[PDB]
Amino acid sequence: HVFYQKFKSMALQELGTNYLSISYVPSLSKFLSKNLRSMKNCIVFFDKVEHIHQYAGIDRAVSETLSLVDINVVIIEMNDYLMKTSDLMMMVMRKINNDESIDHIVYFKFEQLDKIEPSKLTEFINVLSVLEKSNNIAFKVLIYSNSSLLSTSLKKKLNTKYTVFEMPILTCAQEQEYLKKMIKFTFDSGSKLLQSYNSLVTCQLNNKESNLAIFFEFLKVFPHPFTYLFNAYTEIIVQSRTFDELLDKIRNRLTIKNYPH
Amino acid sequence: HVFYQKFKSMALQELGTNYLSISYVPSLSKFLSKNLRSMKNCIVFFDKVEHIHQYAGIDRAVSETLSLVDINVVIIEMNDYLMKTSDLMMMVMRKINNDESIDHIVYFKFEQLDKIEPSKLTEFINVLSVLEKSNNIAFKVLIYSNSSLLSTSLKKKLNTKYTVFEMPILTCAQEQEYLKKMIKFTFDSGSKLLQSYNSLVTCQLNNKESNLAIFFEFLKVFPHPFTYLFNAYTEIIVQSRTFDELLDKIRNRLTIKNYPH
Numbered sequence: 001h002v003f004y005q006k007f008k009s010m011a012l013q014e015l016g017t018n019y020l021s022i023s024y025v026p027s028l029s030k031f032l033s034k035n036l037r038s039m040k041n042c043i044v045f046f047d048k049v050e051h052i053h054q055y056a057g058i059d060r061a062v063s064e065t066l067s068l069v070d071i072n073v074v075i076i077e078m079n080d081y082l083m084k085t086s087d088l089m090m091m092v093m094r095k096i097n098n099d100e101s102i103d104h105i106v107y108f109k110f111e112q113l114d115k116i117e118p119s120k121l122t123e124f125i126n127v128l129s130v131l132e133k134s135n136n137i138a139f140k141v142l143i144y145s146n147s148s149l150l151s152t153s154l155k156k157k158l159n160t161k162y163t164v165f166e167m168p169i170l171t172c173a174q175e176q177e178y179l180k181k182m183i184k185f186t187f188d189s190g191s192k193l194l195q196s197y198n199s200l201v202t203c204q205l206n207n208k209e210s211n212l213a214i215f216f217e218f219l220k221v222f223p224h225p226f227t228y229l230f231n232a233y234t235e236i237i238v239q240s241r242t243f244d245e246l247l248d249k250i251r252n253r254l255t256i257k258n259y260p261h
Numbered sequence: 262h263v264f265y266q267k268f269k270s271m272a273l274q275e276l277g278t279n280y281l282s283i284s285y286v287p288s289l290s291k292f293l294s295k296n297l298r299s300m301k302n303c304i305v306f307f308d309k310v311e312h313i314h315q316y317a318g319i320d321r322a323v324s325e326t327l328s329l330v331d332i333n334v335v336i337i338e339m340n341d342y343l344m345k346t347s348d349l350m351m352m353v354m355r356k357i358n359n360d361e362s363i364d365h366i367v368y369f370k371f372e373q374l375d376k377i378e379p380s381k382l383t384e385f386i387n388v389l390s391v392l393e394k395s396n397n398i399a400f401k402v403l404i405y406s407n408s409s410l411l412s413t414s415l416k417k418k419l420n421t422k423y424t425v426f427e428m429p430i431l432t433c434a435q436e437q438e439y440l441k442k443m444i445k446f447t448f449d450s451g452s453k454l455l456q457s458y459n460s461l462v463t464c465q466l467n468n469k470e471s472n473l474a475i476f477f478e479f480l481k482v483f484p485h486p487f488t489y490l491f492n493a494y495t496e497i498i499v500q501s502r503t504f505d506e507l508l509d510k511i512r513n514r515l516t517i518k519n520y521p522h
C-alpha cells in the first residue's frame with residue numbers, strides 16, 4: 001500500500017541530479033553553450049575548482065552541452081598523456097576519421113586538481129595548431145585547475161585566444177542554503193508523501209537541537225560538505241526499507257558519528 | 262587522482278533515471294503528451310501495471326508531462342477519499358482558486374494496484390460533471406490498476422469518454438535485454454573509466470559462470486526483477502569507496518545470497 005520503492009528510486013535520482021546541479025552559477029550554463037555548442041576552437045580554464053562536487057557539476061554540464069551538438073564530437077583525455085606524424089596526432093586523427101559527418105569537434109580534457117613533460121606539451125600544441133589550420137575540425141581544450149606554464153605555452157604558440165571561468169567561492173550562508181536545497185525533493189509535486197518528507201526536513205533544519213540541524217553545523221566547518229552530505233544521505237535512503245524507517249533516520253539516526261560508513 | 266565520487270554520483274543518478282525510463286514503451290510517452298498536455302478532460306486507465314518499476318516509470322512520465330503544461334496544474338490524490346457544496350467539491354475548489362491563471366487543470370490520481378464506498382464514488386463523479394460544465398477548468402483522472410464498477414460508473418454518469426493504456430508484458434528475452442540496459446551507463450561518453458565499467462559488465466554478462474550472469478539467471482524467475490536489481494546495484498555503488506572496490510563487487514561479491522540487504 002505505501003510504495004516506498006517509488007519514493008526511494010525518485011529520491012535517489014533527484015539527490016543525484018541536485019548534487020550535479022550548477023544552478024548556483026547560472027553564468028556557467030550560458031558560458032558553456034557559448035563556447036562548446038559552436039564550430040569555433042577555444043581553450044577554457046576552470047579556476048578555483050576546489051571541490052569534487054564542483055568538478056562533477058561542470059563535467060555533467062559539459063557532457064550535456066556536447067549532447068546538444070548536431071555534429072560529430074570526439075573525446076580525448078590528455079591527463080594520461082602529459083602529466084607522465086606524432087603518436088598523439090595519429091591517435092587524434094584515427095578518432096576524427098569517423099565517416100559520421102563532414103565537420104568534427106575534438107574535446108581535449110585535462111584535469112590538474114591536486115596541483116608535465118615539456119616534450120609531451122609541445123606535441124599537443126602541435127596537434128592543436130594543425131586542427132586550427134583545418135576547416136571542418138574544431139577543438140575545445142578544457143582544463144580544470146586549483147597550469148602556469150600551460151597557459152603561457154598555449155597563449156604563445158597558438159592563434160586561438162583562451163577564456164577563463166572563475167568558480168565562485170560560496171559564503172557559509174550560500175553553502176548552507178544550497179546544501180538544504182540538495183535534500184529537498186520536487187518529484188510528485190503536491191503529493192502528501194512529498195509534503196511529509198519536505199516538512200520533516202524543513203522543521204528539523206529550523207530546530208537547532210535536532211540531528212539534522214547539528215549535522216549541518218558540522219558541514220559549516222567540513223572541507224567538502226556536498227560530498228559528505230551526499231554520501232550520508234544516499235545511505236539513509238538506500239538502507240531504509242520503508243518510508244517510516246527513512247523519517248526515523250533523519251530524526252534520530254543521522255549523526256557525524258553514524259553517517260557515512 | 263581517481264575521482265570515484267564523480268562516477269558514484271553520476272552512476273547513482275543514471276541508475277535512477279534508467280529504472281524510471283519508459284523507453285521500452287515509446288507509445289506511452291506520446292499517449293501522455295496527447296491526453297495530459299491539452300485542455301480536454303479525459304479519464305485514463307493504466308491496466309496490467311503489474312510492477313512497482315512500471316508504476317514509478319508511468320508516474321515520472323506523467324510528472325514530467327505536467328511540467329511542460331504552461332497553465333496552472335493542481336493535484337488531488339483520490340486514494341485516501343474513495344477506498345475508505347460537498348466535502349470533495351470544497352477541497353477541489355479551494356485548490357483551483359489559486360489566482361495563478363484563468364485556466365486550471367485538476368489531476369485526480371487513483372491507484373488500485375493490490376486489488377470503494379459507493380457514496381464516496383458518486384460525490385467524485387458529481388465534482389467531475391461540474392468541472393465538465395466549467396470552461397477554464399479541465400480534469401485528468403488517472404487510474405492505475407491490475408475498477409470494474411469504477412469504469413462503468415465513470416462511463417454511465419459522465420460525458421468525457423475514457424481511454425485505456427495496456428502496459429506491455431515483456432518476454433523473458435525483452436526483460437533480460439532491458440535489465441542489462443539498466444546497469445549500462447552513458448555519462449562521460451568516450452572516457453576510459455566508463456569504458457572499463459561497461460566492458461566489465463558486458464563481458465561478465467556473457468560469461469555464463471560469473472556472479473553477474475548467475476545473478477541475472479535468478480532475475481528470469483524473480484517476480485520483480487527491476488527492483489531486485491536496482492536495490493542490489495545501488496548498494497554496490499553506494500557501499501564502494503573506490504572504483505576498484507566497485508569492479509571487485511560486480512566480479513566477486515554480487516550474489517542473491519549477498520544483495521540487497
Ligand SMILES: [Cl-]
Nearest residue numbers: 053224225226
Ligand atoms: Cl563539496
Ligand SMILES: [Cl-]
Nearest residue numbers: 314485486487
Ligand atoms: Cl520489476
